[PDB]
Each structure stands twice: as C-alpha cells, then as structure tokens.
Design a protein around this ligand. Structure first.
Ligand SMILES: Cc1noc(C)c1-c1ccc2c(c1)nc(CCc1ccccc1)n2CCN1CCOCC1
Length: 113
C-alpha cells in the first residue's frame, strides 16, 4: 500500500482527536513529560524514547508517518512509556489505561478502511 500523507492525516487525526477529548485523562499526555517540573530526575534514564500527544500531532502535520502502523507505534510508545515509568496505583497509569481503551476502539475501523 502506497500512502497519501494528507489522506493519512485525514484518516488518522480523528483517532488522535479522540484521545485529546478525554478529560481529565489526556491532560498529562498533551505535552512532553518535563522531569524538572514533575520532580522525577530519573525519568529520562527509564524512558529512552519519550512520546506525547503534541509530538504525534506535529508528526502527522509534517507528514512524518509514511504508513499508518508507524503512527500506531508512536501512540503505543506513549502508552508503554507511561505504564513503564509509573506505579500501577497512580493517576497517570490509570489515565493511560483509559486512553489505550479509547485508542483501540477508534483505530480498529480506521486501519480496516
Ligand atoms: C505522562 C506521564 N508519564 O509519567 C508522568 C509522571 C507523567 C505526567 C505528565 C504530566 C503530568 C502528570 C504526570 N501529572 C500532572 C498533573 C499533576 C502535577 C504533578 C507534579 C507537578 C505538577 C503537576 N501532569 C502535568 C499536566 N500539565 C497540565 C498543563 O500542561 C502541562 C502539563
């Protein structure tokens, strides 16, 4: 499959928008994790490949995703990072799990079409 980056933007962006609409659950994911602001100086040791919603949006706007799985891989990276770093009892871990449930529902049909 050859992929049109504006046709992929139009197909994929509503799945990203689905994640942004979740409030409060998307709030920690809207900008890059800032370890200084959050007081978590080991974050970049543990999380080698950070990702967040703003980064995925800018990637999709600059035509960075040659094919849709690369996009799906970034969304999962963002989730896996938050699950790796955070305790299971934490607000952000539980928000991650909600976002992942939303994403799975949204992306399923879109990757079909
Ligand atoms: C994502 C992710 N992965 O690991 C952590 C830790 C986060 C993360 C990532 C971000 C998190 C956050 C947790 N909790 C909050 C709000 C509470 C807070 C805690 C300490 C200091 C200040 C606030 N935010 C901050 C959310 N703000 C909202 C407004 O825009 C900037 C980020």
């Amino acid at each position: 499959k050859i992929f049109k980056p504006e046709e992929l933007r139009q197909a994929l962006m509503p799945t990203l928008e689905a994640l942004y609409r979740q409030d409060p659950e998307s709030l920690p994911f809207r900008q890059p994790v800032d370890p200084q602001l959050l007081g978590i100086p080991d974050y970049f040791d543990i999380v080698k490949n950070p990702m967040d919603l703003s980064t995925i949006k800018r990637k999709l706007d600059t035509g960075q995703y040659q094919e849709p799985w690369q996009y799906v891989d970034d969304v999962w990276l963002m989730f896996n990072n938050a699950w790796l770093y955070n305790r299971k009892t934490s607000r952000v871990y539980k928000f991650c799990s909600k976002l992942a449930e939303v994403f799975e529902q949204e992306i399923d049909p879109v990757m079909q079409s």
